[PDB]
């Protein structure tokens, strides 16, 4: 269960950020993740970030999550952020990375594929078993001492020693 190779973390670009109709805590993002049309994803960063701090930025999306329909609007995936105290920041791949590319760990096998779909039940879903081992360190993202590597470099975060969620 504890195994990052089952996770599909890929690069997305935010084309639109829209305030949610009923629940205002959520931002309804539209994120081109390399597929035929951009995914709809809902992120509760509205409390700490405003719409411009998200728009036209490259983010990291956990993509092999099951589809949900939160509060009337639909949401397919989630944007990975790093938190430290009452600050929260997007995980950022170096600029110039190709949309859709898979973020892999240092020294992990790229042939080892992620799950087609992660479990509806949280307990059996690895991510929640892995999340304690997801940390930020000196501005770099880590899983159990291993750095996240994109095609252009390590995944940066404008924080240090932060927790990843």
From TrEMBL:
Residues 3-104 form the TRNA-binding domain. It comes from the Eukaryota. This is (malaria parasite P. vivax) hypothetical protein. The chain holds residues 241 to 405 of 405 of the full protein.
């Amino acid at each position: 269960l504890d195994d990052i190779t089952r996770l599909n973390i890929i690069v997305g670009y935010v084309e639109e950020v829209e305030i949610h109709p009923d629940a205002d805590t959520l931002y309804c993002l539209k994120i081109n993740v390399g597929e035929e049309k951009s995914r709809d994803i809902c992120s509760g960063l509205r409390l700490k970030k405003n719409s411009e701090d998200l728009l036209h930025k490259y983010v990291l999306v956990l993509a092999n999550l099951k589809e949900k329909s939160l509060r009337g609007r639909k949401s397919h995936g989630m944007v990975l952020c790093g938190s430290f105290g009452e600050q929260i920041e997007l995980l950022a791949p170096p600029d110039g990375v190709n949309v859709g590319e898979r973020i892999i760990c240092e020294n992990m096998d790229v042939n080892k594929l992620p799950d087609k779909t992660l479990s509806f039940d949280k307990e059996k879903n690895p991510f929640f078993h892995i999340q304690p081992h997801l940390l930020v360190k000196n501005g770099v993202a880590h899983y159990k001492d291993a750095k996240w590597l994109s095609s252009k470099g390590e995944i940066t975060c404008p924080l240090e020693q932060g927790t990843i969620s």
